[PDB]
Design an enzyme around this catalytic site. Structure first.
Site, PDB file in Angstrom:
ATOM      1  N   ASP A 127      20.654  45.161  18.821  1.00 30.55           N
ATOM      2  CA  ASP A 127      20.279  46.071  17.748  1.00 30.55           C
ATOM      3  C   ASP A 127      18.773  46.020  17.496  1.00 30.55           C
ATOM      4  OD1 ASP A 127      19.975  47.560  15.452  1.00 30.55           O
ATOM      5  OD2 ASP A 127      21.707  46.669  14.430  1.00 30.55           O
ATOM      6  N   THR A 128      18.029  46.849  18.223  1.00 31.74           N
ATOM      7  CA  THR A 128      16.569  46.810  18.143  1.00 31.74           C
ATOM      8  C   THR A 128      16.066  47.255  16.777  1.00 31.74           C
ATOM      9  OG1 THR A 128      16.426  49.020  19.146  1.00 31.74           O
ATOM     10  CG2 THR A 128      16.238  47.096  20.594  1.00 31.74           C
ATOM     11  N   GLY A 129      16.906  47.983  16.043  1.00 22.36           N
ATOM     12  CA  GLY A 129      16.548  48.454  14.711  1.00 22.36           C
ATOM     13  C   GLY A 129      16.861  47.457  13.606  1.00 22.36           C
TER      14      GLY A 129
HETATM   15  C1  LIG Z   1      21.274  54.446  11.011  1.00 18.00           C
HETATM   16  C2  LIG Z   1      22.791  54.576  11.143  1.00 18.00           C
HETATM   17  C3  LIG Z   1      23.429  54.895   9.789  1.00 18.00           C
HETATM   18  C4  LIG Z   1      23.126  55.701  12.117  1.00 18.00           C
HETATM   19  N1  LIG Z   1      23.337  53.337  11.666  1.00 18.00           N
HETATM   20  C5  LIG Z   1      23.122  52.124  11.153  1.00 18.00           C
HETATM   21  O1  LIG Z   1      22.450  51.889  10.145  1.00 18.00           O
HETATM   22  C6  LIG Z   1      23.827  51.028  11.894  1.00 18.00           C
HETATM   23  C7  LIG Z   1      25.103  50.734  11.105  1.00 18.00           C
HETATM   24  C8  LIG Z   1      25.948  49.726  11.854  1.00 18.00           C
HETATM   25  C9  LIG Z   1      27.255  49.437  11.124  1.00 18.00           C
HETATM   26  C10 LIG Z   1      27.049  48.610   9.862  1.00 18.00           C
HETATM   27  C11 LIG Z   1      26.246  47.340  10.147  1.00 18.00           C
HETATM   28  C12 LIG Z   1      24.918  47.670  10.813  1.00 18.00           C
HETATM   29  C13 LIG Z   1      25.148  48.458  12.096  1.00 18.00           C
HETATM   30  C14 LIG Z   1      23.822  48.772  12.798  1.00 18.00           C
HETATM   31  N2  LIG Z   1      23.073  49.768  12.018  1.00 18.00           N
HETATM   32  C15 LIG Z   1      21.804  50.031  12.705  1.00 18.00           C
HETATM   33  C16 LIG Z   1      20.762  48.980  12.297  1.00 18.00           C
HETATM   34  O2  LIG Z   1      19.747  48.946  13.297  1.00 18.00           O
HETATM   35  C17 LIG Z   1      20.109  49.293  10.944  1.00 18.00           C
HETATM   36  C18 LIG Z   1      19.140  50.487  11.043  1.00 18.00           C
HETATM   37  C19 LIG Z   1      18.240  50.587   9.831  1.00 18.00           C
HETATM   38  C20 LIG Z   1      16.902  50.192   9.920  1.00 18.00           C
HETATM   39  C21 LIG Z   1      16.077  50.282   8.803  1.00 18.00           C
HETATM   40  C22 LIG Z   1      16.583  50.770   7.601  1.00 18.00           C
HETATM   41  C23 LIG Z   1      17.909  51.181   7.520  1.00 18.00           C
HETATM   42  C24 LIG Z   1      18.736  51.084   8.629  1.00 18.00           C
HETATM   43  N3  LIG Z   1      19.358  48.087  10.563  1.00 18.00           N
HETATM   44  C25 LIG Z   1      19.530  47.455   9.386  1.00 18.00           C
HETATM   45  O3  LIG Z   1      20.266  47.887   8.507  1.00 18.00           O
HETATM   46  C26 LIG Z   1      18.693  46.208   9.160  1.00 18.00           C
HETATM   47  N4  LIG Z   1      17.572  46.508   8.282  1.00 18.00           N
HETATM   48  C27 LIG Z   1      16.332  46.301   8.731  1.00 18.00           C
HETATM   49  O4  LIG Z   1      16.085  45.875   9.855  1.00 18.00           O
HETATM   50  C28 LIG Z   1      15.201  46.609   7.784  1.00 18.00           C
HETATM   51  O5  LIG Z   1      15.621  47.579   6.826  1.00 18.00           O
HETATM   52  C29 LIG Z   1      14.727  48.123   5.934  1.00 18.00           C
HETATM   53  C30 LIG Z   1      13.413  48.386   6.307  1.00 18.00           C
HETATM   54  C31 LIG Z   1      12.545  48.930   5.374  1.00 18.00           C
HETATM   55  C32 LIG Z   1      12.999  49.214   4.092  1.00 18.00           C
HETATM   56  N5  LIG Z   1      14.273  48.964   3.757  1.00 18.00           N
HETATM   57  C33 LIG Z   1      15.135  48.431   4.639  1.00 18.00           C
HETATM   58  C34 LIG Z   1      19.525  45.003   8.647  1.00 18.00           C
HETATM   59  C35 LIG Z   1      20.790  44.924   9.509  1.00 18.00           C
HETATM   60  C36 LIG Z   1      19.897  45.172   7.162  1.00 18.00           C
HETATM   61  S1  LIG Z   1      18.724  43.465   8.834  1.00 18.00           S
HETATM   62  C37 LIG Z   1      17.397  43.396   7.593  1.00 18.00           C
HETATM   63  O6  LIG Z   1      18.109  43.459  10.159  1.00 18.00           O
HETATM   64  O7  LIG Z   1      19.719  42.477   8.411  1.00 18.00           O
END
Ligand SMILES: CC(C)(C)NC(=O)[C@@H]1C[C@@H]2CCCC[C@@H]2CN1CC(=O)[C@H](Cc1ccccc1)NC(=O)[C@@H](NC(=O)COc1cccnc1)C(C)(C)S(C)(=O)=O
Lengths: 99, 99
Positions: free
Chosen positions: A25-27
């Protein structure tokens, strides 16, 4: 190896003694694992995803093998639907994006 | 390019004629952009991740240029701290994970 993105990039990881499937998960800045009762000390933390924030337990210096590549670092544990491998561990296994 | 992961994999994109920074995310099924105007019809949709579900606007067949590579596909628009490029468009630009 090379992993295409046609499908979710799910791979096998090993932590404690317990193979699991996890998303490369690069994001994700951090690594977040589904609820599991890991030994040792931890700290409370909030992390924010698309829906808002959830509560997690932060465990440090936890060994975790990803697709056979050893890593060790911080893992967050809480109510995620999916085991996430984030950049903190992807860097340790020499993972890059390429196009 | 080859992109390492010790920093967030942010790149410049162009869309509807405008430049934006966006995150190359192999964990994301879909492409989600911060609230903005885009031409044409959209459909209400819901999308879920950590912290739960949000409402977005689904635009289909939208051209984006991602770090100099062309894609044309589905773009969701809604509340996010980050413009996200997900697998639906990463595949179009030939992006893979490698380690
Ligand atoms: C974008 C979309 C809705 C299509 N999909 C997802 O969000 C899926 C949901 C999946 C199912 C639920 C669990 C997480 C996975 C992966 N996840 C992708 C992850 O790469 C998501 C993508 C994302 C990145 C930044 C902000 C929001 C979201 N990563 C995270 O949620 C991650 N957030 C971040 O890396 C930083 O987030 C920020 C940045 C700046 C301000 N506020 C928050 C994280 C998982 C919560 S973390 C901090 O790495 O634990």
């Amino acid at each position: 190896p090379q992993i295409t993105l046609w499908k979710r990039p799910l791979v096998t990881i090993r932590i404690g003694g317990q193979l699991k499937e996890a998303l490369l998960d690069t994001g994700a800045d951090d690594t977040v694992l589904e609820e599991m009762n890991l030994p040792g000390k931890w700290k409370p933390k909030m992390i924010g995803g698309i829906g808002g924030f959830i509560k997690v337990r932060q465990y440090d210096q936890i060994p975790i093998e990803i697709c056979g590549h050893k890593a060790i670092g911080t893992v967050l544990v809480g109510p995620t639907p999916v085991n996430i491998i984030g950049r903190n561990l992807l860097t340790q296994i020499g993972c890059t994006l390429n196009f």
